[PDB]
């Protein structure tokens, strides 16, 4: 019954894991020094929680999953495995090798069925098999009732969900990052608890952000370019870096998963949908979607996010390829730090004073008999940018206290125009909600195409030879 995770025994992330999963008990057991250990521990516990609340003897659709992970599970899985990625061949070869080595040593795991399923598919690519297929989400023609997504950011959420509901699916799950920073139209950000940094294509040559690179120079007073520019706005291309692995993503598909509370799917058949958040821990969320046939209720087109920790978004100045520009950066702040800062933001503080006080509140020296250790609450490299945000916030709130307006009227006079004030910092305190306007009515989903066999003969021969032995 104990659940074992690959976390160091002295890590401070263990306490956060326990409060997020109070129905389990977690014991650390480290076997490898992976650079993204925290990002994998959460995913492991999420799968265990889902399987505990799913009715048994029911088939499950797993979209875009490596089949080597669902081998020892006692449930029924149908893996959809297209071959449009650069690391698919390794996963397929590893799955075949592990399957062959497991034959004859495991009593009841349906190993023989899996072996027969793989051989049948390799003979005819277009065949359909209960445990394996090479179609896409909109091409698979196998009926089920539960669908599971895991770290998928390459599909359109309304279009993909509609095709699943046609086959008769009434439940779905999603595991991944938090979409809220991308709804604010930010340029760069970071998730410090999981050692993840993301940035835009146009700021990859910055100097003082999480993910950048530059070089030394002397500085010249003249240089000409054919691009006038004069406009720095976010684009559709975004780079992700989790640990030491790179992932290219797109903004349009990321924002499509910020579903509203209630929405309708209208087409040949009609459905009514909902969306809830069950687990949230410092950036990772788990979502549950229910689908029913018919058309009921009314829609409002609003999305609500609940903040347990502080959320910051400020404006910074940096040099990109030698030129000084300005953009926006977002991050997360622990709740304990935010509560202890309430006293000093009642006055005006310079950035230097804020930085010094934050350092004192963060670092402590701990002695255990004769050993000495230094302990930190949050990562140190984000302190300078955070200190700037508090200084600006404390100044904007004061100005509202002298220019007091009348109650119930709008000031609009020499000309009938109203002045718009400047804003440089958005700060969301703990126990505060944010609301956004999105779309709730979806009509067109027609995306016809032709299916092409994504496989090669050299790969087919290698798999067949590997799956050739008397057991």
Ligand X SMILES: Nc1nc2c(ncn2[C@@H]2O[C@H](COP(=O)(O)OP(=O)(O)OP(=O)(O)O)[C@@H](O)[C@H]2O)c(=O)[nH]1
- Closest CB to other proteins among 273 and 358? 358
39 touches, from ligand ATP, other proteins, ligand X, none (C-beta below 5 to 8 Å by class) = ligand X
**Complete edge-to-edge strand list for the sheet that includes strand 196-200:** 245-250, 237-242, 196-200, 188-191, 323-333, 310-320, 425-428
E-strand ranges in 310-407 read 310-320, 323-333, 364-368, 371-375
Provide the Cα torsion 238, 241, 247, 253; round to 10°: -40
| CA count, 13 A, side-chain hemisphere, 471 | 11
Chain centroid to CA 218 = 40
- Closest CB to a second copy among 60 and 314? 314
Binding test (CB under 8 A) with a second copy, winner from 112, 185, 290, 439: 290
Asked whether position 87 contacts a second copy by CB under 8 A, the answer is yes
Asked whether position 429 contacts a second copy by CB under 8 A, the answer is no
- Shortest separation between residue 76's beta carbon and a second copy, angstroms: 30
- Closest CB to other proteins among 368 and 423? 368
- Closest CB to a second copy among 12 and 246? 246
Site string for Zn ion, 362-401 (x = CB under 5 A): ----------------------------------------
For residue 202, give the 3-state DSSP assignment.
Answer: helix
For residue 368, give the 3-state DSSP assignment.
Answer: strand
Give the residue among 319, 325, 327, 321 at the shortest CA–CA distance from 230.
Answer: 325
Asked whether position 43 contacts ligand X by CB under 6 A, the answer is yes
Asked whether position 245 contacts ligand ATP by CB under 6 A, the answer is no
- Of residues 231-250, those binding a second copy (CB under 8 A): 239, 241, 243-246, 248
- Closest CB to a second copy among 145 and 249? 249
The interaxial angle of helices 111-123 and 88-101, nearest 10 deg, is 140
Which helix (DSSP H) or strand (DSSP E) does residue 182 occupy? helix 180-183
344 touches, from other proteins, ligand ATP, Zn ion, none (C-beta below 5 to 8 Å by class) = other proteins
Rounded to whole angstroms, the Cα distance separating 310 from 333 reads 5
- Shortest separation between residue 147's beta carbon and other proteins, angstroms: 48
Q: What angle do CA 450, 456, 458 make, to 5 degrees?
A: 170
Asked whether position 85 contacts ligand ATP by CB under 6 A, the answer is yes
Cβ–Cβ under 8 Å, residues 14 and 26: yes
- Of residues 120-179, those binding ligand X (CB under 6 A): 151, 153
- Shortest separation between residue 21's beta carbon and a second copy, angstroms: 28
- Shortest separation between residue 428's beta carbon and other proteins, angstroms: 23
Give the residue among 290, 286, 294, 285 at the shortest CA–CA distance from 262.
Answer: 290
Asked whether position 347 contacts a second copy by CB under 8 A, the answer is yes
Alpha carbon separation from 447 to 139, 156, 159, 353, 358 (Å, rounded): 11, 11, 9, 58, 53
- Closest CB to ligand ATP among 298 and 370? 298
Rounded to whole angstroms, the Cα distance separating 419 from 145 reads 56
261: burial class by Cβ within 10 Å (0-12, 13-18, 19+)? middle
Give the residue among 188, 185, 183 at the shortest CA–CA distance from 259.
Answer: 183
Asked whether position 140 contacts Zn ion by CB under 5 A, the answer is yes
- Closest CB to a second copy among 94 and 439? 94
Asked whether position 133 contacts Zn ion by CB under 5 A, the answer is yes
CB contact set of 189 (below 8 Å; sequence gap of 6+): 181, 197, 198, 329, 330, 331
- Shortest separation between residue 431's beta carbon and other proteins, angstroms: 21
- Closest CB to a second copy among 167 and 258? 258
Piece of the chain touching a second copy by CB under 8 A; list 154-162, 331-339, 390-398, 411-419: 331-339
142 touches, from a second copy, other proteins, Zn ion, none (C-beta below 5 to 8 Å by class) = Zn ion
Give the residue among 25, 36, 60 at the shortest CA–CA distance from 144.
Answer: 60
Asked whether position 380 contacts a second copy by CB under 8 A, the answer is yes
Binding test (CB under 8 A) with a second copy, winner from 25, 352, 400, 441: 352
Asked whether position 381 contacts ligand X by CB under 6 A, the answer is no
Alpha carbon separation from 368 to 59, 279, 286, 376 (Å, rounded): 53, 35, 39, 16
- Closest CB to a second copy among 18 and 336? 336
51: burial class by Cβ within 10 Å (0-12, 13-18, 19+)? middle
For residue 40, give the 3-state DSSP assignment.
Answer: helix
Residues that bind ligand ATP (CB under 6 A): 63-64, 80, 82, 84-85, 88, 136-137, 153-155, 247-249, 298
Residues that bind a second copy (CB under 8 A): 33, 35, 83-87, 89-90, 93, 216, 239, 241, 243-246, 248, 261-262, 272, 274, 276-277, 279, 290, 292-294, 296-300, 302, 304-306, 313, 315, 328, 336, 338-340, 342-343, 346-347, 352, 355-356, 359-360, 363, 367-368, 370, 372, 374, 376, 380, 383, 454, 456, 458-459, 462
Residues that bind Zn ion (CB under 5 A): 133, 140, 142
């Amino acid at each position: 019954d104990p659940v074992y995770v690959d976390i160091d025994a002295d890590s401070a992330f263990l306490k956060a894991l326990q409060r997020a999963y109070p129905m389990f008990e977690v014991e650390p057991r480290q076997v490898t020094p992976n650079d993204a250990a925290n990002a994998r521990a959460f995913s492991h516990l999420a799968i265990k929680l889902i399987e505990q609340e799913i009715d048994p003897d029911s088939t499950i659709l797993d979209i875009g999953s490596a089949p080597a992970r669902r081998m020892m599970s006692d449930r029924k899985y149908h893996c959809v495995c297209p071959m449009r990625s650069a690391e698919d061949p390794e996963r397929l070869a590893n799955y075949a090798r592990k399957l062959a080595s497991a034959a004859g040593k495991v009593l009841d795991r349906n190993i023989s069925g899996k072996i027969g399923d793989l051989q049948a598919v390799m003979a005819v690519p277009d065949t359909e098999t209960p445990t394996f297929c090479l179609h896409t989400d909109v091409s698979c023609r196998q009926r089920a009732d539960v669908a599971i997504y895991q770290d998928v950011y390459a599909v359109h959420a309304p279009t993909s969900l509609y095709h699943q509901a046609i086959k008769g699916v009434r439940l779905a799950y999603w595991v991944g990052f938090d979409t809220t920073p991308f709804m604010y139209n930010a340029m760069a950000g970071a998730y410090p608890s999981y050692s993840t940094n993301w940035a835009d294509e146009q700021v990859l040559k910055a100097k003082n952000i999480g993910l950048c690179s530059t070089d030394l120079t002397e500085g010249r007073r003249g240089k000409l370019s054919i691009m006038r520019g004069k406009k720095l706005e976010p684009c559709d291309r975004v780079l992700f870096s989790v640990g030491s692995t790179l992932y290219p993503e797109s903004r349009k598909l990321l924002k499509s998963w910020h579903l509203p509370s209630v929405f309708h799917l209208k087409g040949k058949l009609s459905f009514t949908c909902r969306c809830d958040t069950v687990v949230s821990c410092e950036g990772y969320v788990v979502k549950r979607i229910t689908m029913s046939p018919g058309l009921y209720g009314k829609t409002t087109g609003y999305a609500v996010t609940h903040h347990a920790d502080g959320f910051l978004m400020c404006k910074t100045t940096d040099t990109v390829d030698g030129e000084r520009v300005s953009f926006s950066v977002c991050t997360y702040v622990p709740a304990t730090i935010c509560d202890q800062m309430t006293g000093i933001l009642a006055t005006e503080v310079t950035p230097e004073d804020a930085q010094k006080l934050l350092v004192g509140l963060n670092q402590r020296i701990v002695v255990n008999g004769r050993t000495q250790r230094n302990t930190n609450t949050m990562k140190n490299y984000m302190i300078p940018v955070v200190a700037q945000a508090f200084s600006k916030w404390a100044k904007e709130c004061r100005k509202d206290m002298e220019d007091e307006k009348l109650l119930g009227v709008r000031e609009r006079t020499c000309l009938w125009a109203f002045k718009k004030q400047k804003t440089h910092t958005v700060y969301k305190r703990p126990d505060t909600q944010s609301i956004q306007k999105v779309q709730a009515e979806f009509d067109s989903f027609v995306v016809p195409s032709l299916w092409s066999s994504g496989l090669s003969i050299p790969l087919r021969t290698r798999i067949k030879w590997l799956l050739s032995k008397v057991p």
